[PDB]
Amino acid sequence: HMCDAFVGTWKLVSSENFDDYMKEVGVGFATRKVAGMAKPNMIISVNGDVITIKSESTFKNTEISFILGQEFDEVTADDRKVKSTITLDGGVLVHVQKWDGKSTTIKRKREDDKLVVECVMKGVTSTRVYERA
Ligand SMILES: Oc1cnnc(SCc2ccc(Cl)c(Cl)c2)n1
């Protein structure tokens, strides 16, 4: 029951400061433009200890399956090859991605009927809000 309140199908409804976050990450111009348009469907499910997060979008489709605390390989929508570790901290999913000596942290939390995603790269944060699809 660890992630019950995350499970479901979610649709992106707002994004703030995502271009600046992507710039901080190192995403190039064309990818930032096309990625910034997308309104993905995020589909979260749990089967035993395995959590799956899928993103269905007009830009890219992605999928990760993982066990909390256990590092895995991830290919991000912008085509970074990262090493990821996801934990639960006080009911927040905390996802750290490491690549090329860099690090970014993505937090996903339930707030009211929304799922709020905060993406942080150094001093730059983007907030992406999802509602149930
Ligand atoms: O909206 C969401 C929901 N869950 N995780 C994320 S991860 C942030 C992300 C997404 C797409 C691109 Cl292209 C880049 Cl650079 C980074 N974002």
**C-beta of residue 52 within 8 angstroms of C-beta of residue 65:** yes
Method: X-ray
| Token pair recorded at residue 77 | 């929508």
CA separation, residue 56 to residues 12, 36, 53 (Å): 11, 14, 10
In eight-state DSSP terms, residue 1 is -
What are the extents of the domains in the chain? 4-129
Listing DSSP states for 8-75 in one string gives EEEEEEEEESHHHHHHHHT--HHHHHHHHH---EEEEEEETTEEEEEEE-SS--EEEEE-TT--EEEE
Classify each residue of 27-54 as buried b or exposed e, where b means 16 or more C-beta atoms within 10 Å of its C-beta: beeeebeebeeeebebbbeeeeeebebb
| Token pair recorded at residue 84 | 């990821």
Atom 1 of ligand 1, nearest CA residue: 128
The listed CATH number (3.40.50.300, 3.30.1490.20, 2.30.130.40, 2.40.128.20) that belongs to domain 4-129: 2.40.128.20
**Residue showing tokens 């997060």:** 53
**Residue showing tokens 């901290």:** 89
What resolution in Å is listed for this PDB structure? 1.1
Instruction: Quote the CA–CA distance of 105 and 122 in Å, as a whole number.
Output: 9
Pocket test for ligand 1, best of 23, 33, 43, 55 (most atoms within 8 A of CB): 55
**C-beta of residue 119 within 8 angstroms of C-beta of residue 10:** no
**C-beta of residue 124 within 8 angstroms of C-beta of residue 118:** no
Residue 1's CB is within 10 A of a number of other CB atoms, namely 6
